[PDB]
Design a binder for these strands. Structure first.
Lengths: 145, 129, 24, 158
RNA sequence: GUGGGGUAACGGCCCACCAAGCCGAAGAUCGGUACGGGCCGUGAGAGCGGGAGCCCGGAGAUGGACACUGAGACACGGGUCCA
RNA sequence: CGGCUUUUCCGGAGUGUAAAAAGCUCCGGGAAUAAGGGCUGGGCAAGGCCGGUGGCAGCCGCCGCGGUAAUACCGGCGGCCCGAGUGGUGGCCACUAUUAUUGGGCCUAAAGCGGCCGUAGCCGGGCCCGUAAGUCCCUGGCGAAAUCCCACGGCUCAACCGUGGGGCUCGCUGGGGAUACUGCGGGCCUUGGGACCGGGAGAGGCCGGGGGUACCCCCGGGGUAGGGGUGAAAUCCUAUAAUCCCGGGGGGACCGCCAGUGGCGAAGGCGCCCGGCUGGAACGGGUCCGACGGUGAGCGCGGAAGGCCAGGGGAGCGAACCGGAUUAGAUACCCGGGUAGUCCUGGCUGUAAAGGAUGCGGGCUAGGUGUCGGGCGAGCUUCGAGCUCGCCCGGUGCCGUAGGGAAGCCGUUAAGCCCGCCGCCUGGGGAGUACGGCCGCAAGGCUGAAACUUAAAGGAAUUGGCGGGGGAGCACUACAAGGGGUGGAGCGUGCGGU
RNA sequence: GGUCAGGUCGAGCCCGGGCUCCGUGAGGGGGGAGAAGUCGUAACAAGGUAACCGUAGGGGAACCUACGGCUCGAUCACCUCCU
RNA sequence: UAACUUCGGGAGAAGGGGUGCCUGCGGGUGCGUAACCCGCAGGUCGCAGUGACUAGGGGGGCCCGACUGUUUAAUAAAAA
């Protein structure tokens, strides 16, 4: 034999073998339990709004130095602290403290950030329910409160 | 102890062929091997074979033509419907042409193509090609 | 290497199990 | 041919004759062969040795071949001959000899116990007896209300 | 198990008496997670994952408990009652 | 620029509504009249220039890009994709034979349980016969519609819908038939297995007995001033005298050469000799049972050294320890002392690079050589298989064909080709940790995670460089040998600094 | 339809305990990042005391040392192989 | 019926329920309806059924000493 039983009656042994051996996958083990849903806040949700506590900058990784623009936000329902990285150049200027902000993951929910950012898990799409990519371009819409 | 005596015999008979050996001597010997050998011979894969029935053991001495590409047996010996035959026919056989995926049937023992011609089937014993 | 580690683990286990034992 | 069980050394290359009917250059009547078997059994020789004597002395290699046909339900070979006369031990010569030897080791361990090897041998012998006994129960040389243990062994020997 | 009630009706459903069983490593029990099915998504297949409109069945109607009236209800837009 | 037609859009007619709208559809009027979004470095390339910026600001899915001529950033310009979409974040499947049934590994990459047994379980030699449970065939009862596929038909088209045929999670049912295969039942045989007799080798085990070498000590004699120890040394020992040397006696531990590329054992492991008890093991002869078989979750058992426990012992050795040296310092190499332990008995513990990093059994697949033990046919003989040639059986080594392997290697003692069965692995670190449970006297063992973080971790082989790594070989910017000199002074000169 | 006895179905409420899950505390350990300091030179070349290993004690630390194992082991020598 | 544990214990943990009289039964031991004892059902009164008398309050952390015992016969019984 190379390994696994083979007998007509033997099938339960194989059926159990695979399920046990399947758990050796981290991602399979995680989703099936719901270690993905629970651990990285959101409640599995695609997005969440929160109120801006403050605007902080974080330093870049091992090669890199730069003050990346970030907001510490508090997610509303969840009631957790998230650090969320602001896209676009000018962007941090639009976000007035205590506006309503909408937060997404970035680049796998797995926990991994972009390479450059250290602790930041998250992306900021919106300021006062209008996205930053809008605010980057002058013409479109321009913000409030 | 051995089991699957056919598998061992086939495994020898193929390894035999692989070498190009003149003849083969298979020591543990049976209906399973001998009926399969007679179906194999009937298609023309092997030449003449003699078994002396020793008070210890049949020995078969099989002539090798050189026609066999591979002959081995089927690990679980699964049951296979005549509709499932076509699945097995692509998996195991090298082409549609060769048609000895030996199956044991209600009719006696047949090849794969012979099993087809009657139409009938059963548990998978082995292959020859 | 492997010795390093065993004694670190044993010092960790024994000091921590001392903190369990003397938390016991 | 071989099998490695409590060793890595192959088993003896010895073989039976490939004979299938007998020499007529060796000559005995059915009446005469039963007499040879019975006499040797009376001495206290065992059935293995009994044939050994009959092959060396009387030139008969295996009983089966010589006798039958004379009643061709099955072969007439030493303990069958003996079973009809009522001379057979009820326990089979395989199972008897294994057990006996097993009692003899035990006595050595008693006065002597610091034995790694002899001790281990006791494990080995007993395990074979479990297999040999388990099949015999089914066929009917041993009743199923039996079970193997070492006092029960001393009770058979004695 | 025996006998008995109760119900539309079998039945430890309920009950009296009697027995000591019954279930479990061919994974019981317990914990977690979940309407189930037709289907669906992907995938050469095998396989994996999924229960969404719709259709099919059950469950439920602020949370819990309860009868009456009717063939039928313990009753989403009927009643009683506690929270 | 010339001509043509002319989507929205206007107006009308019916419709429909069984009130509109939906304004369709028919007709009249009538315009070239809604197009965007991403990327353009390698990966994908499917697509390159200029300006600005200058390891910033940014870009970012990864590898990466920006540190003053950036195709990667920003803007422009140009180009590629796609097109009423395009793109982001998240989830799922694919790719991933990275869950292996199709279709995966485990010598060294992750991975073999330190070994065994035998229970559940899986798997099982031949020959005959019964049944036909699995299995195959046929019939039939049946698994709604819908979705899916095919045909035709309908709506301007197609989506969708109608009709007709097929398939469906397809898990159930009944009767009839076949009997290779499998299951069961019965009978039958020796190839596997187990068993016997007789020769035989060995550092297997236990027990009794018994010798000597050396080390140590103690005692007398002899005999003076050092011995010991090292790279040098010191400590150290020794003057009521060491070391030495001679004789005498006591103690504990062991058994060089022998000794092998050797033997034995399941494994841990095993060496004076002798006898007794006792385990395994080869061969010839199959003489006896007659598939009794293989593997084996669970379970049970043995398991170095070190540690623990009780009791007894202690020469030499020696963690810890105490000095000395060395060193910058030395918690070390080196020396001089020393306790636990090393020994025994009883119990416990249960680990390991417990290795051949290679689980076990069977069958098949070039050989060569050496070697151990057994059989055989001879020659030799000291008449004993003592010396030797070969075939063969079992065992241990090397080399190598076919093949396998990434290579190194493996190659009838498989890592080849098959079959059966077990254990285990599935990127790295976190971490062999935490908790929980079990075990243990204790020390600790068994089991065994997640948060978080990473584009590697890793293996073999190549090339060079390197080494207080080895061998060969030269040199005068080398060292020695050797002669003269700089560093001391005054001055000249270049420099550092001021 | 009244009130009242006995009996039955029978929540929430309260108390005590059991199981399970979340937030969170003086104090105390390691863990993955960090550019740059400190101490020593541990491994990697025989890393200048071969290395690893199981276990036991000690030292600030890398570590050192004992015993027993292993070579994936060290230098020519050695021995032995092989030639 | 917890923590803990020298597995012996902790433990009578803790907490919750019941308990009277009458009327009628059953079981055990015996011998034949004695002498007692252990249960079961119904009916029913009080504020309360161990109604009296008899009769432990419990739980947790810490210090010390192992325990039991002994001690200043007669101001100290403890940790000594």
């Amino acid at each position: 034999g190379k390994k696994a039983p083979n007998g007509e009656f033997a099938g339960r042994k194989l059926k159990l073998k695979r399920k046990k051996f399947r758990w050796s996958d981290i991602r399979y083990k995680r989703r099936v339990l719901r270690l993905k849903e629970k651990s990285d806040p959101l409640e599995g949700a695609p997005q969440a709004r929160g109120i801006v506590l403050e605007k902080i900058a974080v330093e870049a990784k091992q090669p890199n130095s730069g003050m990346r623009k970030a907001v510490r936000v508090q997610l509303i329902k969840n009631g957790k602290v998230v650090t969320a990285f602001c896209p676009g150049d000018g962007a941090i200027k639009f976000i007035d403290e205590h506006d309503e902000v909408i937060i997404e993951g970035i680049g796998g929910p797995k926990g991994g950030s972009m390479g450059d950012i250290p602790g930041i898990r998250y992306k900021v799409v919106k300021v006062n329910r209008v996205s930053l990519k809008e605010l980057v371009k002058g013409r479109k819409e321009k913000p409030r409160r | 102890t051995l089991l699957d005596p056919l598998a061992n015999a086939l495994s020898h008979i193929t390894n035999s062929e692989r070498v190009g050996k003149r003849e083969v001597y298979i020591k543990p010997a049976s209906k399973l091997i001998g009926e399969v050998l007679r179906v194999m011979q009937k298609y023309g894969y092997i030449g003449e074979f003699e078994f002396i029935d020793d008070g210890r053991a049949g020995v078969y001495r099989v002539q090798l033509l050189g026609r066999i590409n591979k002959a081995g047996a089927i690990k679980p010996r699964f049951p296979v419907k005549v509709s499932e035959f076509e699945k097995w026919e692509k998996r195991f056989l090298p082409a549609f042409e060769f048609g000895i995926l030996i199956v044991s049937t209600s009719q006696g023992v047949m090849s794969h193509k012979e099993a087809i011609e009657k139409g009938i089937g059963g548990r998978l014993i082995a292959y020859v090609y | 290497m492997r010795w390093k580690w065993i004694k670190k683990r044993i010092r960790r286990l024994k000091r921590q199990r001392k903190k369990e034992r003397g938390l016991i | 041919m071989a099998r490695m069980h409590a060793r890595k050394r192959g088993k003896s290359g010895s073989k039976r004759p490939p004979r299938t009917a007998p020499p007529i250059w060796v000559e005995y009547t059915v009446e005469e062969i039963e007499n040879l078997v019975v006499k040797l059994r009376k001495e206290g020789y065992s059935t293995a040795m009994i044939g050994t004597i009959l092959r060396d002395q009387y030139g008969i290699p295996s009983v089966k071949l010589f006798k039958d046909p004379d009643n061709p339900n099955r072969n007439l070979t030493i303990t069958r001959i003996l079973e009809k006369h009522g001379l057979a031990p009820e326990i089979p010569e395989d199972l008897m000899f294994l057990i006996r030897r097993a009692v003899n080791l035990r006595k050595h361990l008693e006065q002597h116990p610091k034995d790694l090897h002899s001790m281990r041998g006791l494990q080995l012998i007993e395990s074979k007896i479990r297999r040999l006994v388990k099949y015999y129960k089914r066929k009917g040389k041993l009743p199923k209300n039996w079970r193997y243990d070492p006092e029960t062994a001393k009770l058979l020997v004695r």
